Amino acid sequence: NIFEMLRIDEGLRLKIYKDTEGYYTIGIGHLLTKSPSLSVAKSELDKAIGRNSNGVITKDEAEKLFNQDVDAAVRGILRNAKLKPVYDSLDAVRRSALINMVFQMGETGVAGFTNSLRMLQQKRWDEAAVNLAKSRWYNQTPNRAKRVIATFRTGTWDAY
Amino acid sequence: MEILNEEKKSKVHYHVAAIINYLGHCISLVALLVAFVLFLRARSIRCLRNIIHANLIAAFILRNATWFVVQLTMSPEVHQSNVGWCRLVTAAYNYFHVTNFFWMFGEGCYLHTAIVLTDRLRAWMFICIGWGVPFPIIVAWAIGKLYYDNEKCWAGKRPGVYTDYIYQGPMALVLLINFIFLFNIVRILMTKLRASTTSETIQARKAVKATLVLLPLLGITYMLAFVNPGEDEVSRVVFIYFNAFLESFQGFFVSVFACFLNS
Ligand SMILES: COc1cc(Br)cc(OC)c1[C@@H]1C(C)=N[n+]2c1nc(C)nc2N(CCCC(F)(F)F)CCCC(F)(F)F
């Protein structure tokens, strides 16, 4: 379900587009190359896609790129000493909510939520939610934040 | 003469069919209602999968319920008056008939998506397909009834009018697409996912078996409508009895189908 989750929260684009800083990206936020040259961007695509390298990709192609990025996210999570123990103590639904957060704010952002992180490792889920909501994150993207917290509180997909 | 005795014999056999049809509809309505309350009681109601089962069951309860009121429009006096509530009851019944098709289509959309893309928000797509798309089709059919066939409470059958195609052709199309879905699910499950043991995979295989069981059971009655069997007394008695059993127990079959999948 993780693929549909990020897709509601971030969006899906099937052709090459340029981000606010101007690099070339595709899928659920997959950066190809920072070069201003599209050729290098498209070719970086050809190797991953293993097909005719074109601007448009299949929805299926999106999920393999997405999956590659999900590996990279878990690899970062395991390297961080504050993130690794909470991830190992968590079920599969709650792990996705952590990965969701890493997609949005990076590994360094999540490590700052020190109290909520211990509440989660102690399965004190009601208190984790109050701590998470008292943040600037909650105020800047509230509807996404309410979904991710809800997943933490109940361990279900019910919100997405 | 004895022709009259032949006519009296037919009425008795038609009257037996009517008891088959009423009793079947009563049993089916009760079975669906029990399944509905069981689905709602469980905390698994918040899964997208159970939301779809619950709406499907609800759709069948309304159709089976309005079938009784339709019976009160089949009096010859009412059939010919074409009064307003006459036509409203027929149109509500066709609408529910159409929702039944689109909700069975919705189930096929879920099973195809579940095995290919890894709940309360996504449901709106299925509610809009199951409940919302049929409404304008029925309105369009109604405008066509109002304008080319305003007779017999819109339940008339006359050769050369194709108004009912407005709603019947959409029905056939979603069944065509559901057959394409079933071939890909079977192909996907047989080639890839042959060794897969994910929860979605086990449930998908349970679905494919049940769907294969149900497809013959529901299909005979749809073809039997086109049979035009004949005047053999033995052929007539069984044809009418067997078909009445099959149409009237359809809701019961769908309620076993949904409960089984819940496991
Ligand atoms: C493909 O199939 C399929 C597939 C899948 Br993946 C899934 C499913 O479900 C889950 C399904 C199904 C069935 C089993 N049936 N169905 C359908 N779907 C549709 C759309 N439709 C129908 N129908 C019958 C058929 C029959 C024949 F024989 F014709 F076939 C109609 C009627 C409906 C009501 F409700 F009204 F009854």
Instruction: Give the distance (Å) from ligand 1 centre to CA of residue B172.
Output: 10
Note whether A77 and A99 are within 8 A (CB). yes
φ/ψ of residue B259, rounded to 5: -65, -45
Tokens of A120: 């989660």
| Nearest C-alpha neighbor of B99 from the set B154, B48, B60 | B60
Is any ligand 1 atom within 6 A of the Cβ of residue B142?
no
Is any ligand 1 atom within 6 A of the Cβ of residue B104?
yes
Is any ligand 1 atom within 6 A of the Cβ of residue B78?
no
Q: HEC profile for chain B?
A: CHHHHHHHHHHHHHHHHHHHHHHHHHHHHHHHHHHHHHHHHCHHHHCHHHHHHHHHHHHHHHHHHHHHHHHCCCCHHHHHHCCHHHHHHHHHHHHHHHHHHHHHHHHHHHHHHHCCCCCCCCHHHHHHHHHHCHHHHHHHHHHHHHHHCCCHHHCCCCCCCCCCHHHHHHHHHHHHHHHHHHHHHHHHHHCCCCCCCCHHHHHHHHHHHHHHHHHHHHHHHHHHCCCCCCCCHHHHHHHHHHHHHHHHCHHHHHHHHHHHHHC
A63/B121 touch (CB, cutoff 8 Å), yes or no: no
Distances (CA, A) of A58 to A12, A19, A62, A89, B208: 11, 20, 6, 35, 27
Distances (CA, A) of A51 to A27, A29, B63, B113, B151: 16, 20, 50, 24, 60
Helix A92-111 and helix A142-154, axial crossing angle in degrees, nearest 10: 130
The identity of residue A4, as a single letter, is E
Is any ligand 1 atom within 6 A of the Cβ of residue B21?
no
Tokens of B110: 């879920």
Tokens of A158: 């019910």
Q: Which residues pair with B203 in a beta bridge?
A: none
Ligand 1 atom closest to Cα of B178?
1
Note whether B261 and B210 are within 8 A (CB). yes
Residue whose CB lies within 8 A of the most ligand 1 atoms, among B175, B184, B186, B226, for a mutation test: B175
Q: Which residues pair with B70 in a beta bridge?
A: none
Residue whose CB lies within 8 A of the most ligand 1 atoms, among B218, B224, B249, B260, for a mutation test: B218
Contacts of B116 in chain A (CB under 8 A): 60
Contacts of A3 in chain B (CB under 8 A): 117-118
B47 touches chain A (CB under 8 A): yes
The identity of residue B63, as a single letter, is R
Q: Which sequence positions of A are flagged as catalytic?
A: 10, 19
Closest residue in A to B118 (Cα–Cα): A1
The identity of residue A117, as a single letter, is L
A10 class by beta-carbon count within 10 Å (0-12 exposed, 13-18 middle, 19+ buried) = middle
Note whether B182 and B110 are within 8 A (CB). no
| Nearest C-alpha neighbor of B151 from the set B234, B98, B83 | B83
Tokens of B112: 């195809």
Tokens of A70: 């999900």
Q: Would you state the CATH architecture of domain B2-262?
A: Up-down Bundle (1.20)
> Which domains does chain A possess?
1-154 (1.10.530.40)
The 8 Å CB, 24+ separation contacts for B32-39 are B32/B57, B32/B60, B32/B61, B32/B64, B32/B251, B32/B252, B32/B254, B32/B255, B33/B61, B34/B255, B35/B255, B35/B258, B35/B259, B36/B61, B38/B259, B38/B262, B39/B258, B39/B262
Instruction: Give the distance (Å) from ligand 1 centre to CA of residue B215.
Output: 6
| Nearest C-alpha neighbor of A152 from the set A98, A94, A113, A101 | A94
Q: Which residues pair with A26 in a beta bridge?
A: A30
Note whether B106 and B93 are within 8 A (CB). no
The identity of residue B84, as a single letter, is G
Each domain of chain B, given as residue ranges in start order, spans 2-262
Ligand 1 atom closest to Cα of B185?
6
Distances (CA, A) of B119 to A155, A158, B64, B112, B250: 13, 5, 29, 16, 29
Instruction: Give the distance (Å) from ligand 1 centre to CA of residue B230.
Output: 28
| Distance separating alpha carbons of residues B30 and B23, to the nearest angstrom | 11
DSSP for chain A?
Answer: -HHHHHHHHH--EEEEEE-TTS-EEEETTEEEESSS-HHHHHHHHHHHHTS---S---HHHHHHHHHHHHHHHHHHHHHSTTTHHHHHTS-HHHHHHHHHHHHHHHHHHHHT-HHHHHHHHTT-HHHHHHHHHSSHHHHHSHHHHHHHHHHHHH-SSTT-
Note whether B24 and B249 are within 8 A (CB). yes
Note whether B248 and B21 are within 8 A (CB). yes
Nearest CA to ligand 1 atom 28: B219
Q: Which residues pair with A13 in a beta bridge?
A: A27
Contacts of A60 in chain B (CB under 8 A): 116
